[PDB]
Amino acid sequence: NLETMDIYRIPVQSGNHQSSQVFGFQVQPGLDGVFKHTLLGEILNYYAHWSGSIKLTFVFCGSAMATGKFLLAYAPPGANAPKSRKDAMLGTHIIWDVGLQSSCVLCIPWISQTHYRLVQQDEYTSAGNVTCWYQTGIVVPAGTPTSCSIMCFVSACNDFSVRLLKDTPFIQQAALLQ
Amino acid sequence: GDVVEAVENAVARVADTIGSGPSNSQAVPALTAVETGHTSQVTPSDTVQTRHVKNYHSRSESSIENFLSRSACVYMGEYHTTNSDQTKLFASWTISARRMVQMRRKLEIFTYVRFDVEVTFVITSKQDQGTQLGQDMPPLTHQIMYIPPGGPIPKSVTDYTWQTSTNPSIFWTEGNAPPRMSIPFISIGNAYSNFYDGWSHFSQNGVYGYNTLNHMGQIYVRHVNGSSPLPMTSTVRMYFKPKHVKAWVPRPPRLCQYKNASTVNFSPTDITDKRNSITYIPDTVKPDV
Amino acid sequence: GAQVSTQKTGAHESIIHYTNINYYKDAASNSANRQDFTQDPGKFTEPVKDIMVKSLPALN
Amino acid sequence: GAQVSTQKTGAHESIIHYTNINYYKDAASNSANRQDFTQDPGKFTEPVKDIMVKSLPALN
Amino acid sequence: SDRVRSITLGNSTITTQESANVVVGYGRWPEYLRDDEATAEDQPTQPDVATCRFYTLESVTWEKDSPGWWWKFPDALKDMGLFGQNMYYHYLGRAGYTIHVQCNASKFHQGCLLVVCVPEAEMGCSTVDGTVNEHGLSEGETAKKFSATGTNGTNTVQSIVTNAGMGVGVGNLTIFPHQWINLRTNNCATIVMPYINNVPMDNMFRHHNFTLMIIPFVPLNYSSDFSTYVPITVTVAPMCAEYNGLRLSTAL
Amino acid sequence: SDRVRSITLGNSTITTQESANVVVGYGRWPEYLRDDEATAEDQPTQPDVATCRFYTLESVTWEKDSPGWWWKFPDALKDMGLFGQNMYYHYLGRAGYTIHVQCNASKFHQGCLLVVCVPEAEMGCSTVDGTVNEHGLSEGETAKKFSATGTNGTNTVQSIVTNAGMGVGVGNLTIFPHQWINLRTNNCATIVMPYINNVPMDNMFRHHNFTLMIIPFVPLNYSSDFSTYVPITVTVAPMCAEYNGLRLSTAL
């Protein structure tokens, strides 16, 4: 999917898939592939330190007749990624009800031993993970597609800042006339 | 305020975390409509119970001035003390920040920029390799000359043109501090333009892009002692530190590598790195697997 | 005819300021404005006419 | 905008002071605080709740 | 609209774009035990956020012929984070709850669920002169299932929906706090239950303060509606949890 | 007299009829984290009584030739009731402690113990170019033993008392908060330690905030004193415990 519009689509569907986790990823805004080339990520890569809360907006793109509730969870570090909805709901989470408001915001509050984390994150400055689960499956009437996509947007909250300027790993050259 | 002044107070504090308790209402801050093109203004206190935190963190180092205002190499070239080529006796290029990527990607984050520039030159010389190496050459003195578009161009290290009755020049001798000077905002327009989705000719042809807008002249640099029994060669490195900056209409950071200096050309490149599955999160916290 | 302004605060929670005099005739010669810290995210995060109160639906 | 303070006294029991001006924008650039002489042995030599008057027994 | 609604307890938040209202106990919001109502003399522990937050139980599938489901309550949350740990370590406990049952379908689906909290739902045995099992009563999270016919077996609850395991008319369960989830109009149910008992506090393993029952009255139905999977999910959040009589942990 | 003294935390009380004084940190009483000193943004849990009370560790025997003993601290209380449970469930924790070392003998016995709390007691390895073990560092309750001679073995702490496992002069351990238990005058030692670290909060499994060392400087001795058994007992009580970053429990 590295060069196709799919990389941006989170697949979700009608029928019984509760045991099936929808997605999950580490919270390393400047380092993990999921975030590094994001607007927030590209910026973090010109610095060595970051701090702040992050907003993850999820937008449902199925038909208007589609329905459903999801559980969006964020787990601070210290344990491995929740492996079931039971485990995930013990952490920070919102239960999102698909409706006229197509989008839902999971805000990742800043919880850390230190005031700052390395953009080049290590285990010492771990930030945890966010995982998503069907809270109550996707139901749909006849004549409508039984599977759709959910998109995810990221952005910094107003308590966010960065420090210690450095060059980006992302750009380079072998010779002049660049 | 006035973006030309070297002093101006005020701390750039981020927001405090407002203390938040339990809620049962019709307020639904966590539910928005991304279609409007608006970015949600939700903070932790809107979705979880938060304590109060007096936050002192400042955004000082991410101000446009502090982000761009660090000298960056934008060019490097060589010239010889002695050679049969005449041409190889002096260096020359056309001013632009498009030949070294680091600086270029930084500027290209903005569509337009306006600023003064602090130029610093680092010049070094080495004695060329050869069978006989003994000589006693006095200190080398160089001449850097700026030729605004339209000025006569040097054709040899001894051309009358180096008289600089009017072009600005810098004479510097090795061993001293690197030469330096400020240049004002020199554009014909109201802001330097980093991108130009346009042409040079009115008939929608000619040259496309950044180049048609450039034309800031060129630099020529030569040795002044002019000689050395045995061959030597110098390298001139030029650094740009923009200062007193203003920037408009930000754009995404260049993702694909640059292919050349005159174009925005690129090869298709990956959106990001792959990972195993859409649920893959590595297991840290194990008695080491 | 000099100017005194405060230094960026360092390693601790009057001698925290510096003095400067400009010696050149052109503003271009001056040092950088590293102390100006304004901000206006709005131009970009919220360029919608019709104010979105967001605590309210956003549609309806 | 300078500061005048006194010098550490030398070889004898007005010209015993110096003047200083800070030329840099960061406090880190300043010289050392060699003239600050506070002290609080108590934290270490006497960290007992219940004040020991010692001229009195200390037990009993 | 008033269909929109958000709720926040601890580090958790719930949202709906299609709510009815919110039912509150017998009109009573949970409160902590007052000094003039207390007997246990030791200082209580009130974990607050660590304990009073949304725990989501394992979901169930609504099938065209599902009779219904139930859960016993303080037990059922016994393995939920610190709420459960505080249960194991204390002799006495007291709490209220916000119960949020979720079930979305489509404008082309139909069906209707009764969602009720029955205080003190003592159940009858299948074997009329026998006695129940704790197993026949509750399986923690998960959920016991009602049945469409009379059941047999020693220890199991006589679970024919029609008599709600209590020997009454299921259609009269409405004197208890409840909401309905009618798919055509609504996609969730929210009930806030206050602590209800004949003593100020009680042991949370030995006594099921109340039972949550989800009984479909009009069955699930649809057409070529490439959505046959319609799950129901229960999320509950203890409110004002307080504990007394601390000692070693109870034997599982 | 001022030898008499009582202390109460939670559902527990300590008494002595032969105390010296009470030493307090570096003169600092424990306090909860203030808003202008915090970074972790989530609401803390402050269990209070359930957590801030006296836990007694397994006793040790003072023999005529005992070199000494030590305990690492937040770890060591990791299995003590709710204090330990809160440790397992949270990423960050912070606490102060009242440490009460007990040792009674008789007017005909003699001996002298140094009781010290060493903040950040990083220890050295026996094998000079090797590294320690968590096991060589701490065994939870119980207690590691110092040694009278140089030790060998990979992973174990170079424990010859004389250098306190830290490469210094044991007789200089007095710059750290401490009391002495001189049997002829005193039968217990009490030290209140405030939270000390270079960050406002920290993980309680990964970092031993401080080490308690009991080192006899003048050895136990007696005569036909039909009492050869002289035990030492450590009781400690967390103070102002607060926790942040709640999630599933840590892997033992």
mmCIF file of N, CA and C in Angstrom, chain F residues 33-136:
data_model
loop_
_atom_site.group_PDB
_atom_site.id
_atom_site.type_symbol
_atom_site.label_atom_id
_atom_site.label_comp_id
_atom_site.label_asym_id
_atom_site.label_seq_id
_atom_site.Cartn_x
_atom_site.Cartn_y
_atom_site.Cartn_z
ATOM 1 N N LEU F 33 2.665 15.868 45.299
ATOM 2 C CA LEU F 33 3.198 16.666 44.187
ATOM 3 C C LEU F 33 2.369 17.920 43.909
ATOM 4 N N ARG F 34 3.005 19.083 43.799
ATOM 5 C CA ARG F 34 2.275 20.340 43.566
ATOM 6 C C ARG F 34 2.063 20.626 42.088
ATOM 7 N N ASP F 35 1.023 21.384 41.755
ATOM 8 C CA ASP F 35 0.757 21.652 40.343
ATOM 9 C C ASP F 35 1.882 22.305 39.578
ATOM 10 N N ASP F 36 2.702 23.099 40.258
ATOM 11 C CA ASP F 36 3.782 23.769 39.552
ATOM 12 C C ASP F 36 5.074 22.959 39.484
ATOM 13 N N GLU F 37 4.960 21.687 39.859
ATOM 14 C CA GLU F 37 6.084 20.780 39.824
ATOM 15 C C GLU F 37 5.741 19.548 39.028
ATOM 16 N N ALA F 38 4.501 19.453 38.561
ATOM 17 C CA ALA F 38 4.054 18.264 37.829
ATOM 18 C C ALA F 38 4.217 18.232 36.295
ATOM 19 N N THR F 39 4.335 17.041 35.688
ATOM 20 C CA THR F 39 4.315 16.958 34.210
ATOM 21 C C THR F 39 3.210 16.006 33.801
ATOM 22 N N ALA F 40 3.141 14.843 34.448
ATOM 23 C CA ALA F 40 2.097 13.891 34.099
ATOM 24 C C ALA F 40 0.785 14.612 34.375
ATOM 25 N N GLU F 41 -0.035 14.688 33.317
ATOM 26 C CA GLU F 41 -1.320 15.400 33.291
ATOM 27 C C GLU F 41 -2.576 14.716 33.765
ATOM 28 N N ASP F 42 -2.561 13.395 33.888
ATOM 29 C CA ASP F 42 -3.778 12.745 34.313
ATOM 30 C C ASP F 42 -4.038 12.867 35.828
ATOM 31 N N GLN F 43 -5.294 12.752 36.216
ATOM 32 C CA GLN F 43 -5.646 12.789 37.625
ATOM 33 C C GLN F 43 -4.956 11.656 38.414
ATOM 34 N N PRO F 44 -4.336 11.981 39.563
ATOM 35 C CA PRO F 44 -3.677 10.919 40.339
ATOM 36 C C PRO F 44 -4.706 10.138 41.167
ATOM 37 N N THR F 45 -4.293 8.985 41.715
ATOM 38 C CA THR F 45 -5.125 8.173 42.614
ATOM 39 C C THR F 45 -4.383 8.381 43.912
ATOM 40 N N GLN F 46 -5.105 8.633 44.985
ATOM 41 C CA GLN F 46 -4.419 8.768 46.258
ATOM 42 C C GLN F 46 -5.203 7.930 47.246
ATOM 43 N N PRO F 47 -4.968 6.610 47.226
ATOM 44 C CA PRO F 47 -5.588 5.565 48.047
ATOM 45 C C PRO F 47 -5.634 5.912 49.531
ATOM 46 N N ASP F 48 -4.704 6.759 49.944
ATOM 47 C CA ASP F 48 -4.642 7.176 51.315
ATOM 48 C C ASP F 48 -4.483 6.019 52.332
ATOM 49 N N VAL F 49 -5.468 5.816 53.221
ATOM 50 C CA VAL F 49 -5.348 4.805 54.268
ATOM 51 C C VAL F 49 -5.095 3.392 53.788
ATOM 52 N N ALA F 50 -5.701 3.012 52.669
ATOM 53 C CA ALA F 50 -5.539 1.663 52.147
ATOM 54 C C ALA F 50 -4.083 1.364 51.808
ATOM 55 N N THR F 51 -3.351 2.442 51.607
ATOM 56 C CA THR F 51 -1.991 2.393 51.131
ATOM 57 C C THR F 51 -0.910 2.972 52.044
ATOM 58 N N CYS F 52 -1.248 4.038 52.763
ATOM 59 C CA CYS F 52 -0.300 4.684 53.640
ATOM 60 C C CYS F 52 -0.495 4.187 55.068
ATOM 61 N N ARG F 53 0.121 3.036 55.345
ATOM 62 C CA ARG F 53 0.031 2.369 56.646
ATOM 63 C C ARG F 53 1.277 1.500 56.912
ATOM 64 N N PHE F 54 1.379 0.954 58.115
ATOM 65 C CA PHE F 54 2.539 0.144 58.433
ATOM 66 C C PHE F 54 2.559 -1.306 57.938
ATOM 67 N N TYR F 55 3.537 -1.610 57.095
ATOM 68 C CA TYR F 55 3.718 -2.970 56.585
ATOM 69 C C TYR F 55 4.948 -3.521 57.325
ATOM 70 N N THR F 56 4.868 -4.716 57.898
ATOM 71 C CA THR F 56 6.047 -5.225 58.592
ATOM 72 C C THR F 56 6.723 -6.290 57.715
ATOM 73 N N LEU F 57 8.019 -6.144 57.448
ATOM 74 C CA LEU F 57 8.739 -7.127 56.623
ATOM 75 C C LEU F 57 9.203 -8.262 57.498
ATOM 76 N N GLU F 58 9.581 -9.358 56.869
ATOM 77 C CA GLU F 58 10.058 -10.551 57.571
ATOM 78 C C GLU F 58 11.316 -10.189 58.384
ATOM 79 N N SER F 59 11.382 -10.595 59.660
ATOM 80 C CA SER F 59 12.517 -10.238 60.546
ATOM 81 C C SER F 59 13.843 -10.907 60.224
ATOM 82 N N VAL F 60 14.947 -10.387 60.764
ATOM 83 C CA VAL F 60 16.258 -11.028 60.575
ATOM 84 C C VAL F 60 16.911 -11.286 61.938
ATOM 85 N N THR F 61 17.847 -12.226 61.989
ATOM 86 C CA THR F 61 18.487 -12.540 63.257
ATOM 87 C C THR F 61 19.857 -11.910 63.414
ATOM 88 N N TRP F 62 20.052 -11.186 64.502
ATOM 89 C CA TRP F 62 21.336 -10.562 64.737
ATOM 90 C C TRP F 62 22.209 -11.596 65.443
ATOM 91 N N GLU F 63 23.255 -12.024 64.751
ATOM 92 C CA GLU F 63 24.178 -12.997 65.299
ATOM 93 C C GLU F 63 25.450 -12.305 65.704
ATOM 94 N N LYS F 64 26.213 -12.938 66.595
ATOM 95 C CA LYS F 64 27.452 -12.337 67.074
ATOM 96 C C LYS F 64 28.395 -11.898 65.960
ATOM 97 N N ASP F 65 28.205 -12.399 64.739
ATOM 98 C CA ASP F 65 29.091 -12.029 63.621
ATOM 99 C C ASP F 65 28.387 -11.523 62.337
ATOM 100 N N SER F 66 27.142 -11.075 62.468
ATOM 101 C CA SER F 66 26.401 -10.560 61.335
ATOM 102 C C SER F 66 27.116 -9.334 60.818
ATOM 103 N N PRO F 67 27.347 -9.273 59.499
ATOM 104 C CA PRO F 67 28.025 -8.140 58.875
ATOM 105 C C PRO F 67 27.025 -7.034 58.688
ATOM 106 N N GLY F 68 25.822 -7.396 58.256
ATOM 107 C CA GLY F 68 24.799 -6.395 58.032
ATOM 108 C C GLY F 68 23.739 -6.887 57.072
ATOM 109 N N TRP F 69 22.799 -6.006 56.740
ATOM 110 C CA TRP F 69 21.693 -6.316 55.832
ATOM 111 C C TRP F 69 21.252 -5.067 55.054
ATOM 112 N N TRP F 70 20.514 -5.268 53.961
ATOM 113 C CA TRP F 70 19.960 -4.145 53.210
ATOM 114 C C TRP F 70 18.699 -4.522 52.460
ATOM 115 N N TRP F 71 17.935 -3.504 52.083
ATOM 116 C CA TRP F 71 16.693 -3.676 51.333
ATOM 117 C C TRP F 71 16.609 -2.526 50.343
ATOM 118 N N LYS F 72 16.147 -2.798 49.119
ATOM 119 C CA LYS F 72 16.014 -1.739 48.103
ATOM 120 C C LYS F 72 14.595 -1.182 48.301
ATOM 121 N N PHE F 73 14.271 0.088 47.985
ATOM 122 C CA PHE F 73 12.920 0.374 48.349
ATOM 123 C C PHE F 73 11.661 0.485 47.602
ATOM 124 N N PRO F 74 11.421 1.415 46.701
ATOM 125 C CA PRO F 74 10.008 1.016 46.336
ATOM 126 C C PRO F 74 9.772 -0.548 46.165
ATOM 127 N N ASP F 75 10.696 -1.278 45.500
ATOM 128 C CA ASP F 75 10.626 -2.773 45.328
ATOM 129 C C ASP F 75 10.832 -3.309 46.713
ATOM 130 N N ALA F 76 10.064 -4.263 47.223
ATOM 131 C CA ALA F 76 10.293 -4.734 48.660
ATOM 132 C C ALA F 76 9.018 -4.595 49.374
ATOM 133 N N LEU F 77 8.222 -3.683 48.852
ATOM 134 C CA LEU F 77 6.911 -3.461 49.356
ATOM 135 C C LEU F 77 6.003 -3.835 48.189
ATOM 136 N N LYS F 78 6.577 -4.306 47.074
ATOM 137 C CA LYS F 78 5.748 -4.634 45.910
ATOM 138 C C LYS F 78 4.682 -5.694 46.112
ATOM 139 N N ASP F 79 4.731 -6.443 47.209
ATOM 140 C CA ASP F 79 3.686 -7.428 47.447
ATOM 141 C C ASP F 79 2.896 -7.128 48.687
ATOM 142 N N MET F 80 3.058 -5.906 49.178
ATOM 143 C CA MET F 80 2.348 -5.471 50.352
ATOM 144 C C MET F 80 0.967 -4.850 50.033
ATOM 145 N N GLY F 81 -0.071 -5.647 50.234
ATOM 146 C CA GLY F 81 -1.429 -5.183 50.049
ATOM 147 C C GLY F 81 -1.747 -4.259 48.901
ATOM 148 N N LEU F 82 -2.491 -3.185 49.171
ATOM 149 C CA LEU F 82 -2.864 -2.311 48.071
ATOM 150 C C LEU F 82 -1.740 -1.393 47.619
ATOM 151 N N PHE F 83 -0.694 -1.262 48.435
ATOM 152 C CA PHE F 83 0.426 -0.420 48.029
ATOM 153 C C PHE F 83 1.073 -1.094 46.849
ATOM 154 N N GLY F 84 1.186 -2.412 46.943
ATOM 155 C CA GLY F 84 1.779 -3.176 45.865
ATOM 156 C C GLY F 84 0.880 -3.236 44.643
ATOM 157 N N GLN F 85 -0.418 -3.421 44.852
ATOM 158 C CA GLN F 85 -1.340 -3.485 43.732
ATOM 159 C C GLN F 85 -1.297 -2.178 42.960
ATOM 160 N N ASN F 86 -1.308 -1.053 43.669
ATOM 161 C CA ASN F 86 -1.265 0.206 42.956
ATOM 162 C C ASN F 86 0.043 0.310 42.165
ATOM 163 N N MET F 87 1.118 -0.300 42.657
ATOM 164 C CA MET F 87 2.388 -0.305 41.922
ATOM 165 C C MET F 87 2.226 -1.057 40.596
ATOM 166 N N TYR F 88 1.638 -2.250 40.667
ATOM 167 C CA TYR F 88 1.511 -3.040 39.460
ATOM 168 C C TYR F 88 0.688 -2.380 38.381
ATOM 169 N N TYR F 89 -0.397 -1.720 38.770
ATOM 170 C CA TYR F 89 -1.282 -1.086 37.798
ATOM 171 C C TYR F 89 -0.920 0.279 37.238
ATOM 172 N N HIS F 90 0.066 0.959 37.826
ATOM 173 C CA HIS F 90 0.423 2.277 37.330
ATOM 174 C C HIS F 90 1.853 2.372 36.815
ATOM 175 N N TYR F 91 2.036 3.232 35.829
ATOM 176 C CA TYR F 91 3.329 3.485 35.207
ATOM 177 C C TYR F 91 4.163 4.349 36.145
ATOM 178 N N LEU F 92 3.526 5.358 36.759
ATOM 179 C CA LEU F 92 4.217 6.280 37.673
ATOM 180 C C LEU F 92 3.711 6.267 39.111
ATOM 181 N N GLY F 93 4.639 6.430 40.046
ATOM 182 C CA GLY F 93 4.282 6.444 41.451
ATOM 183 C C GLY F 93 5.200 7.373 42.227
ATOM 184 N N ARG F 94 4.767 7.778 43.420
ATOM 185 C CA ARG F 94 5.547 8.682 44.249
ATOM 186 C C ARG F 94 5.137 8.511 45.709
ATOM 187 N N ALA F 95 6.134 8.365 46.578
ATOM 188 C CA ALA F 95 5.806 8.208 47.981
ATOM 189 C C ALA F 95 6.949 8.524 48.884
ATOM 190 N N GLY F 96 6.582 8.807 50.136
ATOM 191 C CA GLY F 96 7.533 9.078 51.189
ATOM 192 C C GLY F 96 7.369 7.904 52.148
ATOM 193 N N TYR F 97 8.214 7.796 53.171
ATOM 194 C CA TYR F 97 8.052 6.681 54.088
ATOM 195 C C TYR F 97 8.442 6.949 55.525
ATOM 196 N N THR F 98 7.795 6.235 56.437
ATOM 197 C CA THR F 98 8.199 6.308 57.829
ATOM 198 C C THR F 98 8.790 4.910 58.000
ATOM 199 N N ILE F 99 10.055 4.865 58.371
ATOM 200 C CA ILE F 99 10.732 3.603 58.556
ATOM 201 C C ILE F 99 10.962 3.447 60.038
ATOM 202 N N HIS F 100 10.568 2.294 60.562
ATOM 203 C CA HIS F 100 10.727 2.021 61.989
ATOM 204 C C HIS F 100 11.420 0.654 62.216
ATOM 205 N N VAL F 101 12.723 0.701 62.520
ATOM 206 C CA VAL F 101 13.510 -0.491 62.786
ATOM 207 C C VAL F 101 13.431 -0.819 64.294
ATOM 208 N N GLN F 102 13.035 -2.052 64.622
ATOM 209 C CA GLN F 102 12.868 -2.474 66.013
ATOM 210 C C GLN F 102 13.872 -3.540 66.465
ATOM 211 N N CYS F 103 14.494 -3.329 67.624
ATOM 212 C CA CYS F 103 15.427 -4.325 68.158
ATOM 213 C C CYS F 103 15.611 -4.169 69.652
ATOM 214 N N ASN F 104 15.001 -5.046 70.441
ATOM 215 C CA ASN F 104 15.142 -4.942 71.881
ATOM 216 C C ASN F 104 16.026 -6.066 72.397
ATOM 217 N N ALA F 105 16.748 -5.806 73.476
ATOM 218 C CA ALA F 105 17.623 -6.811 74.065
ATOM 219 C C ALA F 105 17.465 -6.649 75.579
ATOM 220 N N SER F 106 18.553 -6.556 76.347
ATOM 221 C CA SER F 106 18.402 -6.406 77.798
ATOM 222 C C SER F 106 19.480 -5.534 78.365
ATOM 223 N N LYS F 107 19.309 -5.078 79.598
ATOM 224 C CA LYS F 107 20.342 -4.232 80.173
ATOM 225 C C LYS F 107 21.672 -4.979 80.277
ATOM 226 N N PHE F 108 21.680 -6.296 80.035
ATOM 227 C CA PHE F 108 22.934 -7.056 80.111
ATOM 228 C C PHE F 108 23.504 -7.472 78.772
ATOM 229 N N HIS F 109 22.898 -6.981 77.696
ATOM 230 C CA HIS F 109 23.362 -7.243 76.335
ATOM 231 C C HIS F 109 24.086 -5.980 75.836
ATOM 232 N N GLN F 110 24.849 -6.075 74.748
ATOM 233 C CA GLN F 110 25.488 -4.882 74.217
ATOM 234 C C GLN F 110 25.656 -5.028 72.718
ATOM 235 N N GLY F 111 25.690 -3.894 72.018
ATOM 236 C CA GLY F 111 25.852 -3.909 70.579
ATOM 237 C C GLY F 111 25.359 -2.596 70.003
ATOM 238 N N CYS F 112 25.776 -2.282 68.787
ATOM 239 C CA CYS F 112 25.362 -1.040 68.191
ATOM 240 C C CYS F 112 25.162 -1.121 66.666
ATOM 241 N N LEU F 113 23.946 -0.798 66.222
ATOM 242 C CA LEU F 113 23.563 -0.832 64.809
ATOM 243 C C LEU F 113 23.469 0.567 64.183
ATOM 244 N N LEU F 114 23.982 0.722 62.962
ATOM 245 C CA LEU F 114 23.815 1.984 62.243
ATOM 246 C C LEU F 114 22.582 1.697 61.352
ATOM 247 N N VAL F 115 21.577 2.579 61.342
ATOM 248 C CA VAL F 115 20.397 2.372 60.492
ATOM 249 C C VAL F 115 20.360 3.565 59.535
ATOM 250 N N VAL F 116 20.593 3.310 58.246
ATOM 251 C CA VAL F 116 20.651 4.367 57.234
ATOM 252 C C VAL F 116 19.791 4.192 56.010
ATOM 253 N N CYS F 117 19.312 5.320 55.492
ATOM 254 C CA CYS F 117 18.569 5.321 54.248
ATOM 255 C C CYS F 117 19.465 6.045 53.257
ATOM 256 N N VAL F 118 19.961 5.304 52.277
ATOM 257 C CA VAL F 118 20.845 5.862 51.258
ATOM 258 C C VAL F 118 20.086 6.110 49.946
ATOM 259 N N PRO F 119 19.874 7.383 49.578
ATOM 260 C CA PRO F 119 19.156 7.630 48.332
ATOM 261 C C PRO F 119 20.049 7.248 47.172
ATOM 262 N N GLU F 120 19.478 6.582 46.173
ATOM 263 C CA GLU F 120 20.214 6.255 44.970
ATOM 264 C C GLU F 120 21.487 5.438 45.285
ATOM 265 N N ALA F 121 21.329 4.301 45.961
ATOM 266 C CA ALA F 121 22.492 3.487 46.326
ATOM 267 C C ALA F 121 22.915 2.528 45.232
ATOM 268 N N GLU F 122 23.447 3.065 44.144
ATOM 269 C CA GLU F 122 23.935 2.246 43.030
ATOM 270 C C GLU F 122 25.071 1.376 43.570
ATOM 271 N N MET F 123 24.989 0.073 43.316
ATOM 272 C CA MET F 123 25.967 -0.865 43.832
ATOM 273 C C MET F 123 26.905 -1.425 42.819
ATOM 274 N N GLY F 124 28.074 -1.806 43.302
ATOM 275 C CA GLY F 124 29.092 -2.341 42.422
ATOM 276 C C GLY F 124 29.083 -3.849 42.320
ATOM 277 N N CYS F 125 29.654 -4.348 41.236
ATOM 278 C CA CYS F 125 29.716 -5.778 40.991
ATOM 279 C C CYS F 125 30.973 -6.403 41.636
ATOM 280 N N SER F 126 30.835 -7.697 41.983
ATOM 281 C CA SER F 126 31.869 -8.525 42.632
ATOM 282 C C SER F 126 32.905 -8.794 41.596
ATOM 283 N N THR F 127 32.394 -9.116 40.424
ATOM 284 C CA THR F 127 33.224 -9.357 39.282
ATOM 285 C C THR F 127 33.408 -7.952 38.737
ATOM 286 N N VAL F 128 34.600 -7.408 38.938
ATOM 287 C CA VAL F 128 34.870 -6.041 38.532
ATOM 288 C C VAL F 128 34.529 -5.594 37.126
ATOM 289 N N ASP F 129 34.622 -6.468 36.149
ATOM 290 C CA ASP F 129 34.277 -6.030 34.807
ATOM 291 C C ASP F 129 32.986 -6.668 34.336
ATOM 292 N N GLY F 130 32.170 -7.110 35.294
ATOM 293 C CA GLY F 130 30.891 -7.725 34.984
ATOM 294 C C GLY F 130 29.788 -6.783 35.417
ATOM 295 N N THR F 131 28.528 -7.216 35.416
ATOM 296 C CA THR F 131 27.445 -6.341 35.830
ATOM 297 C C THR F 131 26.529 -7.085 36.778
ATOM 298 N N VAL F 132 25.813 -6.346 37.618
ATOM 299 C CA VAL F 132 24.916 -6.988 38.551
ATOM 300 C C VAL F 132 23.642 -7.486 37.905
ATOM 301 N N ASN F 133 22.896 -8.160 38.763
ATOM 302 C CA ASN F 133 21.633 -8.869 38.575
ATOM 303 C C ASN F 133 20.598 -8.103 39.321
ATOM 304 N N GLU F 134 19.322 -8.270 39.003
ATOM 305 C CA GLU F 134 18.369 -7.586 39.881
ATOM 306 C C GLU F 134 18.387 -8.416 41.182
ATOM 307 N N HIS F 135 18.619 -9.717 41.031
ATOM 308 C CA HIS F 135 18.665 -10.603 42.180
ATOM 309 C C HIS F 135 19.814 -10.264 43.117
ATOM 310 N N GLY F 136 20.948 -9.881 42.550
ATOM 311 C CA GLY F 136 22.055 -9.551 43.420
ATOM 312 C C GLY F 136 21.781 -8.264 44.171
#
